[PDB]
């Protein structure tokens, strides 16, 4: 209905919102762009699904986040790849992991904070309902 993607309208407003909050984050700038194969050419044969915050603001413009799960999926693989990618004791990688997981906690945070429960139950029912 028409009030089903007002509905899904809102929820990409909302997570375009969230998104560029994370994107201007001084600390999260090294998730701001997919990473560079010249600089990193094992990277795209090391890591199956790449994701960053551009790529998530493509993916919304795209309706492919009908819930704020299906959103937080993708910086939890924002997360998970940094993690994956850089295990390693040394301080450029520790660096890395401690941005990453603060980039997951920080969406994490803000969802709770602003996020009523029941509108993101009304897009899983839509969703499930297709
Ligand atoms: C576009 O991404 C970057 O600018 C960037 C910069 C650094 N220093 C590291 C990385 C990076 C990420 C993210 N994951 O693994 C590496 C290496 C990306
Ligand atoms: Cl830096």
């Known amino acids: 209905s028409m009030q089903e993607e007002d509905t899904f ?6 997570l375009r919102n969230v998104t560029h909050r994370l994107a201007i984050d001084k600390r999260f ?20 699904q790449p994701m960053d915050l551009s790529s998530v603001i493509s993916k919304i413009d795209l309706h492919k986040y009908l ?12 997360c998970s790849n940094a993690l994956e990618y850089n295990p390693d004791r040394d301080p450029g990688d520790r660096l890395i992991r401690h941005r990453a997981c603060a980039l997951r906690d920080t969406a994490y945070a803000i969802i709770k904070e602003e996020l009523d429960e029941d509108f993101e139950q009304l897009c899983e029912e839509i969703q499930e309902s297709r």
Do not use: A, G, N, S
């Not at 309208?9 to 909302?14: D, N, P, S, V, Y």
């Not at 819930?67 to 924002?78: E, F, P, Q, S």
């Open 9 to 14: 309208r809102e929820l990409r407003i909302f």
């Open 29 to 48: 700038r090294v998730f701001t762009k997919p990473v560079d194969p010249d600089e990193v050419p094992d990277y795209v044969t090391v890591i199956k």
């Open 67 to 78: 819930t704020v799960k299906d959103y937080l999926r993708d910086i939890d693989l924002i």
